[PDB]
Structures are given as structure tokens and as C-alpha cells.
């Protein structure tokens, strides 16, 4: 604050700027995907697809 006082003033009340946190979390989740492919499908798909 920068309030206005007289010349024979009284040096007014205290003031100071405040800083704050943000805390922005990262660690509980994840995106994922699965395949579930066989071991015979990957064998018969190399003489039978071009």
C-alpha cells in the first residue's frame, strides 16, 4: 500500500507483497494400450500376406 499522509504524519501501517505456490500434480495416472496377439497368428501371417 502507498496511502497518502500529511507532512507531520505518522508513518502508516505495514505492507508487503505476497507470493503463492502452484503445486500442479503429475503422479497418479497414465494412458495405456494392450495387444493380446497369439503365437500362431504371427507365424501364419508371413507366408499368407504380401
Amino acid at each position: 500500500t502507498a496511502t497518502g499522509v500529511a507532512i507531520t504524519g505518522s508513518a502508516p501501517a505495514a505492507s508487503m507483497d505476497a507470493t503463492l505456490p502452484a503445486q500442479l500434480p503429475i503422479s497418479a495416472a497414465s494412458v495405456q494400450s494392450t495387444f493380446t496377439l497369439n503365437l500362431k497368428e504371427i507365424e501364419e501371417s508371413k507366408e499368407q500376406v504380401t
Binding site: 503365437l39 500362431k40 504371427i42 507365424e43 501364419e44
Partner: protein
């Protein structure tokens, strides 16, 4: 032409041969001969990795 004998040799009687099954009880039919030709039957199995 040699006569090879297997212990595990049989044949399942078909559904058209059903009056021959009730008279004998079973359908295992251990009386077979199987006049086969040698280089005409083949066996297969997949070469899956590992």
C-alpha cells in the same frame, strides 16, 4: 509288401453302421487291414518361433 502291426490300431464305425454297433456293443472295431501306399501320407506341424 510287409504287414506292420500297431497296438493302437482301430477305426470308429460310422453312423450308417449303427445296427452293427448295437449287436457288438462297442464301436472300436479291431479287425482292420488298411492296405496303404507308403509315399502318399504326410504329416505336418507348425515351425513357430523358438
Amino acid at each position: 509288401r510287409p504287414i506292420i502291426d500297431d497296438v493302437f490300431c482301430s477305426r470308429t464305425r460310422t453312423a450308417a453302421e449303427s445296427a452293427i454297433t448295437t449287436a457288438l456293443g462297442t464301436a472300436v472295431d479291431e479287425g482292420v487291414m488298411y492296405f496303404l501306399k507308403k509315399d502318399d501320407l504326410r504329416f505336418y506341424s507348425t515351425p513357430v518361433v523358438g
